[PDB]
Structure 1
Amino acid sequence: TYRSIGSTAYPTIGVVLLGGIANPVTRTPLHTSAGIAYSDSCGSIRSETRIYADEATHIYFNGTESTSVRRVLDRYSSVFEEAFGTKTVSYSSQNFGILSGSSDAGAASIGAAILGLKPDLDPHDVENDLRAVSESAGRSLFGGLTITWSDGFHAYTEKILDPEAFSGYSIVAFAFDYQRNPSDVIHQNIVRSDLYPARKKHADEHAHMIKEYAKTNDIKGIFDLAQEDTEEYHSILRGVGVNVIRENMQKLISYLKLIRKDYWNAYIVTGGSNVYVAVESENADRLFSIENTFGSKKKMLRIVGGAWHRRPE
């Protein structure tokens, strides 16, 4: 028997932005969404996880002990008993350079560690258990561009494009320093909007459009749609009191409308205080070098693959 296993996953960015979860425990998405897994050129932006045999159950985030994760570990106690010789395992996670979408990565890394222990497991089944840790875990488990179909009862994640399809594109992230609204605050309020039912329908409509664009690798059509979805999403949120796009972020966006005339770009805003800007590779350095970032820090990002594990120790 072994003593521990390591694994790694990459953070995610919504493309069809998810708002609302069926239940605070199982965290099933109330509607269909889509996303991409991202990192930087070196793959340095990531979440690393270690699951190991222990006398008692410990959960560690960035070296800090934590009093959701235990639920997943317990459900797969049989896997660990076989691999380690005990059901009692501890979890240790370390995040690096992640902007938004950290929880997705942490959850996916758990899944890839489990699949690494019992490879014949159905990853789509494991994904269901992982949503308790983060509702968008599928994005990071499968990588690339995914669509997660959902009616609020059952959710299923599908790979639509590999990261290689995005070889000609880059994402420049502008990180602002504004305090962010917890994701749970967003899920809680968006359902209160009168426009929510319509939003659930349009979200599904957009996902289908993304799948068609995928047929001919219309990468630009997909990011353009993501900008439109971003605008709808955050209009609904503002209407319920959740304002993600703050002053300097609005300013950056207005700047982007001008630059778009010069060379193509499209932006996405999730729940955090970041503006993600899609752009062609030949223009990435150019965008990355602009001066008036309105106090924001800049990161160069790429689309990457799904969670993976290492040989058991």
Structure 2
Amino acid sequence: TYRSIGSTAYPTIGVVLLGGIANPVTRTPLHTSAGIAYSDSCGSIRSETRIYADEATHIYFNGTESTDDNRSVRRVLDRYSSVFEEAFGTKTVSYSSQNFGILSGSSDAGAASIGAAILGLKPDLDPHDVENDLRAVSESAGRSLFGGLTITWSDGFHAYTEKILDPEAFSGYSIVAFAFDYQRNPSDVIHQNIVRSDLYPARKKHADEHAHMIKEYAKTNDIKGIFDLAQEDTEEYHSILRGVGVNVIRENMQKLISYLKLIRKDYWNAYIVTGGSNVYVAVESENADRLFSIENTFGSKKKMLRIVGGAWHRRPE
């Protein structure tokens, strides 16, 4: 007796960076990882989803209907067919997705907002179980589903996401994102190449250690400790990637990073580079406008970001 439900989720940044998935269908992370959901101050940077009763199955991405390259979304929609039967009176549903202002981490947001829609129609479903199905759409969906600072434990067969700190724990902090024009390496290029490194078995253990250290830091809200560690993790991650032919940190990004080391002598900052052509800089809020004003950006564009919460839905219509 309903016909439609809308949902929203926020994009994510890794703080213990994931590389390697169990297989391209289920996409279970091969090791433990960690991340944060982000948006701007108005929450306008976001991914929105609508799932709705239809006569035939349509899938739309940013307004554009898709004919293929949509098997993962379709798979999730089929597995929860009974949820749509019960709430809408039909198994036949269409899906519409729209991204706003996202830098990196958009597929995570898209996956979580699907989960939020499904959870909105059947709220006694276990979000940790639903997350398992969402990973087929994006392997780090849990970061956006649960929001704040999360850890996703994984042995490559089972993975489990837990929220470690609320977005409020980061209210004294900001992230200035520097967005560069370099074409990014696709997610799958990173996953495929990183597992070739003979450093990879150690990397899996180190990622899990970093997650435990982050959880320790969380006990006393040592946010600087967490971002300092994320930067260390960033540098190991990309060191390994460069060794198997994947160079994310391109020339002007290296130049920005060098400059960041200079001003770190003046006031605290720490940076993160995920899979895309962005440099994310954490900074105490009292220095955020200062950092945001630097003129030496080496061609990049600046966005002011903050840590935000998990995915949510509107009332079904």
Show the counterpart of 2:158. 154
Whole-angstrom distance in 2 between the partners of 1:66 and 1:251: 39
Per-residue deviation, 1:66: 1.5
In the TM superposition, 1:209-220 aligns within 5 A as 209-220=213-224
Gap runs ≥5 in structure 1: none
Whole-angstrom distance in 2 between the partners of 1:66 and 1:41: 32
2:245 counterpart (237, 241, 245): 241
Whole-angstrom distance in 1 between the partners of 2:84 and 2:289: 46
What per-residue deviation string (whole Å, max 9, x for no partner) do you get for residues 44-80 of structure 1?
Answer: 0000110000111111000111221000000000000
Whole-angstrom distance in 2 between the partners of 1:247 and 1:144: 31
What per-residue deviation string (whole Å, max 9, x for no partner) do you get for residues 142-192 of structure 1?
Answer: 000000000000000000000000000000000000000001100000000
Is the partner of 1:93 in helix, strand or coil?
strand
What per-residue deviation string (whole Å, max 9, x for no partner) do you get for residues 100-134 of structure 1?
Answer: 00000000000000000000000000000000000
1:196 counterpart (195, 200, 203): 200
Whole-angstrom distance in 2 between the partners of 1:308 and 1:236: 36
Whole-angstrom distance in 2 between the partners of 1:176 and 1:110: 29
Gap runs ≥5 in structure 2: none
Whole-angstrom distance in 1 between the partners of 2:33 and 2:48: 25
Whole-angstrom distance in 1 between the partners of 2:44 and 2:113: 15
Whole-angstrom distance in 1 between the partners of 2:212 and 2:83: 37
Per-residue deviation, 1:140: 0.1
Is the partner of 2:18 in helix, strand or coil?
coil
Whole-angstrom distance in 1 between the partners of 2:2 and 2:119: 15
Whole-angstrom distance in 2 between the partners of 1:7 and 1:70: 17
- TM-score in terms of structure 1 length: 1.00
2:288 counterpart (281, 284, 289): 284
Over the aligned positions, Cα root-mean-square deviation in angstroms equals 0.4
Whole-angstrom distance in 1 between the partners of 2:235 and 2:49: 35
What per-residue deviation string (whole Å, max 9, x for no partner) do you get for residues 235-270 of structure 1?
Answer: 000000000000000000000000100000000000
Show the counterpart of 2:15. 15
Whole-angstrom distance in 2 between the partners of 1:129 and 1:57: 20
Whole-angstrom distance in 1 between the partners of 2:31 and 2:234: 16
What per-residue deviation string (whole Å, max 9, x for no partner) do you get for residues 3-58 of structure 1?
Answer: 10000000000000000000100000000000000000010000011000011111
Show the counterpart of 1:143. 147
Whole-angstrom distance in 2 between the partners of 1:115 and 1:49: 13
Instruction: Kindly tell me the number of residue pairs found equivalent between the two proteins.
Output: 313
- TM-score in terms of structure 2 length: 0.98
Is the partner of 2:238 in helix, strand or coil?
helix
Whole-angstrom distance in 1 between the partners of 2:262 and 2:176: 16
Whole-angstrom distance in 2 between the partners of 1:12 and 1:57: 29
Whole-angstrom distance in 1 between the partners of 2:267 and 2:58: 50
Is the partner of 1:193 in helix, strand or coil?
coil
Whole-angstrom distance in 1 between the partners of 2:74 and 2:56: 12
Whole-angstrom distance in 2 between the partners of 1:33 and 1:189: 18
Is the partner of 2:55 in helix, strand or coil?
coil
Whole-angstrom distance in 1 between the partners of 2:29 and 2:169: 27
2:302 aligned with 1:298: yes
Per-residue deviation, 1:139: 0.1
Whole-angstrom distance in 2 between the partners of 1:149 and 1:311: 32
Is the partner of 2:265 in helix, strand or coil?
helix
The runs of at least 4 aligned residues of structure 1 exceeding 3 Å deviation read none
What per-residue deviation string (whole Å, max 9, x for no partner) do you get for residues 289-310 of structure 1?
Answer: 0001001000000000000000
Whole-angstrom distance in 1 between the partners of 2:293 and 2:24: 42
Is the partner of 2:237 in helix, strand or coil?
helix
Is the partner of 1:262 in helix, strand or coil?
coil
Whole-angstrom distance in 2 between the partners of 1:58 and 1:225: 43
Whole-angstrom distance in 1 between the partners of 2:97 and 2:108: 13
Show the counterpart of 1:66. 66
What per-residue deviation string (whole Å, max 9, x for no partner) do you get for residues 201-231 of structure 1?
Answer: 0000000000000000000000000000000
